[PDB]
Design a protein around this ligand. Structure first.
Ligand SMILES: Nc1ncnc2c1ncn2[C@@H]1O[C@H](COP(=O)(O)OP(=O)(O)OP(=O)(O)O)[C@@H](O)[C@H]1O
Ligand SMILES: [Mg+2]
Lengths: 831, 395
């Protein structure tokens, strides 16, 4: 028994005896001495007074002092000792109570651990309190308004965040944000938003947006509003800022995201801002990069096949697809930019459809120059060539918004053509050209095509895909109504055709990421016959919850996948398998968790169940060639089920799409050797080889940009089109409708880091590129990149690779160093 | 700390859930080489065990009456026996040749499947399957050397059409020589990274074997398995281990190693054509190599990796200090001038030691003074242990 411990044990009686005397003259000194005695051990975090823990029963003698008479000073320090003690046991409605009724002085005077426990209890009882107890939170608001600045004082900002999150009162947080902690609190709140459900999703999003707006951090505020898809808020953020350069960077971000604004002519620098937001300069910037990165030389599909190291109509069509994919958006090719008539006629039947359309891929984003090469094939007499060039028009115009619409002009006069092939090219090109535009003129021109009697089921599905791509995520009433009319007008036997599968997809594309706006749509779909009704319902529900991570919807999809059927009735199981990926793709933890579920689906599932797992893997890891998914797909590349093999090979191509991965190229070459005598598998292998070297390794199909926090709805729509069409790869892809692969054009973006001056000229700068590191939690300055290398700015960023300016000569306008970034000379540098 | 109890609760729940999942699915054993149960095609395994009979590996020795309709094949079943058998009905008579390995059944030993030639596993592992992480951009001051190497070992494989049209036979052998640390193996790694054909790395010390004639056997099998590919590259690092000049010292001085070198020479340029193999050897002692090995047709190109000049040393300094957190005004030209005859390895060590000097002083940026101290420590202080002055007499 320690002598000082024995003294504090004496205070359990002698000080209580001082509080046992009737007169109050001995009450104040003893109580004040006890209040300071608590702080005596509170000066050490690990040290706690064990004798007061024996004073817990002694509250019975002190029960009357803190309860039975005036609260001036007698109960004041008497209750605080009980509160400090209540930190030790459960403290249910106790540790809060005495601090609430007792002394109401500065909270941190009683310790950081004590106030942490008090805040936890505050949240716990705030959950308990009902509406009628609104007259019970008067002191609670004061406690939180004093706790939050205290937590921010000692770099415990994250602990502060939980407090207002639990009580659903994050609103006042913006009031107490200082300039030294706004970045950390905003980063933590944004990192939290991927897991909290509605309405706390939007609540947290708007609170962090307000914190950013208060500090004039316009680029990240615009990013955050884009995550909220609040067009009014996008407009408000864009026109609130007075800095022209910051507005230019924000315009670059909007153009990359596919969101466009109609500025007023009164706004200064309207011309250049509109050009930036319309991506008209994207082609020139990409070509300048390629010239700098000395990759302007065209690549023949032979250089990809590498048949000299290896110890037909389908072959030619696959080679044209490879030529289009490898040379995408480069404008030059040794095989079609030359006299391609011999090559183009080397293909037969619908191959001539894709091959000519492939000629539009090399001219991607180059509308002015691309149409100049389309025009020659626009006058071809053969039915396939003209419509292939028509679709190449839209492919060329895809991703760039031209003020004078060329694609609409060239494709309007062929959407009601008597030939179904000219139609087929025209709607698909129009959809690719105006994806994510919600243009009422284009939609009104396109919509009656679906209801036309001459329009075949293939044409109706193509029209649905297009109208969905124009109105992706817009919840367009007209498109929804006409798609419903087309769906319920068709006969039950007509719905057996897989092209009808595209009708819900466009409908699903209409409400992509909207969430709970499908209940009316689902009620409308209930009247549709089965098993098409289940397919349509699953498709639209998944598209509505795309990129949300809602575990409840994933549970529903897994319940759909659970009951297997001894094909015709089991079609929607593949859609559910794809939907697991479509929902889990939002955040990394969910995707890695869903990888195991995909493995289990491949293991226990039926053929139709396991024929879609490769598509789910491709969707969840597109342009992200992580070795686990690649090995999983390789294990099933030579699968007994032909459809599983085709889907696995195409998923291997999509996963490493644009990555130029050497290992994946070796695997694809080995598969080409193995599948030499199988035309379908060899065609899939050639497609995968073409995708793996997409844009000569300078393009990505990943729908997520801005540090994988912003979802590109157009990219999601294109990937969804291709992957859902791959649910019937035998009839659509390997059949006569391989042109649907050009939907990937909607998802093609350059993995870019181009630093511009304040006058938009290129500005080479030394930068560090390395794998992104999560910087949530750990305080101070933690490194956000590991295993990095120093390159000049015109460099391609792989998936998950962040870039930080190596020096401090330039300040970036936006924290996110992706795409086109404007740099400003640092005043502090060269001081 | 308020979430700690719930953190531990959910963590224990997750661990119990993972164990429960592993209970139904699998993931166990792993010492008997069992794949995860998701890959178990047990019905197909049983069907293979029944239908697919085992086949003993034998070697065909002689074909009697190959012309007629009853050709008999003498096979040597390894350590088992020797038999006179006939081909199965599912094998064409022209698919079996004398001296080739075949696979026969255990009942009548009829030849069932022609088999690839036997290759030593040590020879098989010598082929490179993971390309190195070095490109030609990581080699500075060797512009002419890299160009000469690429136009022999890479250009003919990449674009053979430019050579056949003009009746041009490109060189099929390159010897990289120079003092240690000059970049011979670095350039070889760059070649292996850029190459698309089969790349085989052979270290000369790996061709030294305990028994007589074994090294020549490994060389023969290396060139046999190199010929089973349309295009192939063999890298002979430190070829002076076995490539020494032949001599007669009374006793049997280096007779077996000389036989290995003679076998390599015979494979390179002998009675039989070598094939599409393009060999590549690197050594810091080219003066010790045999004159027959140093002859065109075996080593056609002799690329010298001499010490970098001032421009080359500046280029190497830029290469190795690219990712350095250096100051703004580092005079890399001055640093290159301060180490006249220095290999690229010394320059890399100078960069690393400058970084280490900056780190030791708890500084995040290395100044020019740090690079000067690094030059003093590496180029000057360590000059006692420099391999340069002794080895440029050999090159
Ligand atoms: N020309 C060069 N450019 C850049 N770095 C170089 C150059 N030469 C050497 N180095 C560096 O020095 C190291 C020396 O190792 P390397 O394998 O190139 O030596 P080497 O010439 O094969 O030597 P040895 O004869 O002892 O085998 C390389 O790994 C590289 O980091
Ligand atoms: Mg070496």
């Amino acid at each position: 028994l320690s002598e000082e411990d024995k003294q504090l044990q004496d205070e359990l009686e002698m000080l209580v005896e001082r509080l046992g005397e009737k007169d109050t003259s001995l009450y104040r000194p003893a109580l004040e001495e006890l209040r300071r005695q608590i702080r005596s051990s509170t000066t050490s975090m690990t040290s706690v007074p064990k004798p007061l823990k024996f004073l817990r029963p002694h509250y019975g003698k002190l029960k009357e002092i803190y309860e039975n008479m005036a609260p001036g000073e007698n109960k004041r320090f008497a209750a605080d000792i009980i509160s400090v003690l209540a930190m030790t046991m459960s403290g249910e409605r106790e540790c809060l109570k005495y601090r609430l009724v007792g002394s109401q002085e500065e909270l941190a005077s009683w310790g950081h651990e004590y106030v942490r426990h008090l805040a936890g209890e505050v949240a716990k009882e705030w959950q308990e309190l009902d509406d009628a107890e609104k007259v019970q939170r008067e002191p609670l608001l004061t406690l939180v308004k004093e706790i939050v600045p205290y937590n921010m004082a000692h770099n415990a900002e994250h602990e502060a965040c939980d407090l207002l999150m639990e009580i659903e009162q994050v609103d006042m947080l913006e009031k107490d944000i200082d300039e030294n902690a706004y970045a950390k609190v905003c980063l933590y709140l944004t990192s939290c938003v991927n897991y909290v459900p509605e309405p706390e999703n939007s609540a947290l999003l708007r609170c962090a947006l307000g914190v950013f707006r208060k500090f004039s951090r316009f680029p990240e505020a615009l990013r955050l509003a884009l995550m909220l898809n609040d067009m009014e808020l996008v407009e408000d953020i864009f026109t609130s800022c007075k800095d022209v350069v910051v507005q230019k960077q924000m315009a670059f971000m909007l153009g990359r995201h596919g969101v466009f604004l109609e500025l007023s002519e009164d706004v200064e620098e309207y011309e250049d801002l509109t050009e930036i937001m319309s991506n008209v300069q994207l082609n020139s910037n990409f070509l300048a990069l390629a010239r700098e990165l000395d990759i302007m030389e065209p690549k023949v599909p032979d250089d990809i096949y590498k048949t000299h190291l290896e110890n037909s109509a389908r072959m030619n069509l696959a080679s044209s697809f490879v030529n289009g994919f490898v040379n995408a958006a480069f404008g030059q090719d040794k095989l079609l930019t030359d006299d391609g008539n011999k090559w183009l006629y080397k293909n037969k039947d619908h191959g001539m459809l894709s091959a000519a359309a492939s000629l539009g891929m090399i001219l991607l984003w180059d509308v002015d120059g691309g149409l100049t090469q389309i025009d020659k094939y626009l006058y071809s007499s053969e039915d396939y060539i003209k419509s292939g060039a028509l679709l190449a028009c839209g492919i060329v115009n895809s991703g760039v918004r031209n003020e004078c619409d060329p694609a609409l002009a060239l494709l309007s006069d062929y959407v009601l053509h008597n030939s179904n092939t000219m139609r087929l090219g025209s709607i698909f090109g129009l959809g690719l050209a105006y994806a994510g535009s919600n243009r009422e003129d284009v939609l009104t021109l396109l919509l009656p095509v679906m209801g036309d009697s001459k329009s075949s089921m293939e044409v109706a599905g193509v029209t649905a895909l297009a109208c969905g791509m124009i109105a992706v995520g817009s919840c367009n009433g007209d498109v929804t109504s006409t798609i419903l009319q087309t769906i319920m007008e068709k006969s039950e036997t007509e719905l057996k055709d897989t092209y009808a599968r595209w009708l819900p997809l466009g409908l699903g594309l209409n409400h992509l990421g909207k969430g709970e706006a499908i209940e009316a749509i689902l009620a409308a779909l209930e009247v549709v016959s089965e098993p098409f009704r289940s397919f349509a319902n699953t498709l639209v529900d998944v598209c509505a919850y795309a990129g949300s991570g809602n575990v409840l919807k994933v549970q529903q999809l897994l319940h759909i996948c659970s009951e297997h059927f001894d094909a015709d009735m089991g079609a929607h199981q593949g859609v559910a398998v794809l939907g697991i990926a479509l929902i889990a793709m939002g955040e990394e933890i969910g995707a890695e968790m869903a990888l195991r579920t995909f493995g289990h689906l491949l293991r226990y599932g039926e053929p139709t169940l396991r024929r879609a797992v490769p598509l789910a893997l491709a969707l969840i890891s597109v342009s992200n060639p992580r070795l686990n998914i690649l090995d999983t797909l390789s294990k099933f590349s030579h699968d007994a089920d032909p459809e599983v093999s085709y889907n696995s090979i195409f998923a291997m191509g999509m996963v490493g799409s644009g990555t130029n991965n050497a290992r994946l190229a070796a695997m694809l070459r080995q598969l080409a050797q193995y599948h030499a005598k199988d035309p379908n598998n060899l065609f899939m292998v050639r497609l995968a080889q073409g995708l793996t070297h997409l844009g000569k390794g300078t393009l990505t199909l990943c729908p997520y940009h801005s540090d994988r926090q912003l979802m590109s709805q157009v990219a999601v729509a294109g990937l969804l089109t291709v992957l859902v069409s791959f649910l019937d790869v035998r009839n659509i892809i390997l059949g006569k409708s391989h042109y649907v692969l050009y939907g990937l054009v909607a998802a093609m973006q350059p993995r870019m880091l181009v630093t511009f001056d304040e006058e938009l000229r290129p500005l080479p700068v030394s930068v560090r590129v390395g794998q992104a590191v999560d910087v949530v939690g750990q305080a101070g300055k933690p490194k956000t990149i590991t295993g990095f290398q120093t390159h000049t700015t015109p460099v391609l960023l792989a998936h998950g690779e962040r870039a930080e300016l190596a020096t401090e000569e330039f300040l970036p306008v936006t924290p996110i160093l992706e795409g086109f970034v404007i740099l400003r000379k640092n005043p502090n540098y060269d001081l | 700390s308020t979430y700690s109890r719930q953190i531990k609760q959910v963590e224990d729940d997750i661990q119990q859930l993972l164990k429960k999942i592993n209970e139904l699915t699998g993931i166990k054993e792993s010492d008997t080489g069992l794949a995860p149960p998701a890959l178990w095609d047990l019905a197909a395994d049983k069907q293979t065990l029944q239908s697919e009979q085992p086949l003993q590996v034998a070697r065909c020795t002689k074909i009697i009456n190959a012309d007629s309709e009853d050709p008999k094949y003498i096979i040597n079943v390894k350590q088992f026996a020797k038999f006179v058998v006939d081909l199965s009905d599912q094998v064409a008579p022209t698919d079996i040749e004398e001296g080739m390995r075949v696979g026969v059944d255990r009942n009548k030993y009829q030849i069932h499947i022609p088999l690839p030639p036997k290759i030593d596993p040590t020879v098989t592992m010598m082929q490179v399957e993971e390309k190195p992480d070095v490109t030609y951009s990581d080699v500075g001051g060797c512009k002419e050397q890299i160009e000469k190497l690429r136009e022999v070992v890479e250009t003919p494989l990449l674009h053979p059409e430019r050579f056949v049209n003009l009746g041009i036979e490109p060189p099929k052998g390159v010897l990289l020589f120079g003092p240690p640390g000059t970049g011979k193996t670095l350039c070889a790694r760059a070649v292996a990274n850029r190459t698309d054909a089969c790349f085989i790395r052979v270290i000369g010390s790996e061709l030294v074997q305990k028994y007589v004639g074994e090294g020549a056997r490994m060389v023969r099998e290396l060139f046999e398995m190199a010929r089973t590919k349309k295009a192939c590259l063999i890298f002979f690092d430190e070829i002076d281990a076995i490539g020494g000049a032949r001599f007669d010292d009374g006793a049997g001085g280096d007779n077996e190693v000389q036989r290995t070198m003679l076998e390599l020479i015979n494979q390179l340029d002998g009675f039989d054509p070598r094939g599409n193999i393009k060999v590549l050897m690197a050594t810091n002692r080219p003066d010790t190599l045999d004159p027959a090995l140093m002859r065109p047709g075996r080593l056609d190109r002799k690329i010298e990796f001499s010490l970098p000049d001032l421009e080359g040393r500046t280029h190497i300094f830029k290469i190795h200090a690219r990712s350095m957190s250096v100051e703004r005004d580092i005079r890399f030209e001055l640093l290159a001038r301060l180490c006249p005859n220095s290999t690229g390895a010394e320059i890399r060590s100078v960069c690393t030691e400058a970084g280490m000097f900056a780190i030791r002083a708890r500084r995040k940026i290395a100044t020019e003074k740090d690079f000067l101290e690094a030059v003093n420590k590496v180029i000057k202080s360590y000059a006692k242990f420099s391999a340069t002055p002794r080895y440029m007499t050999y090159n």
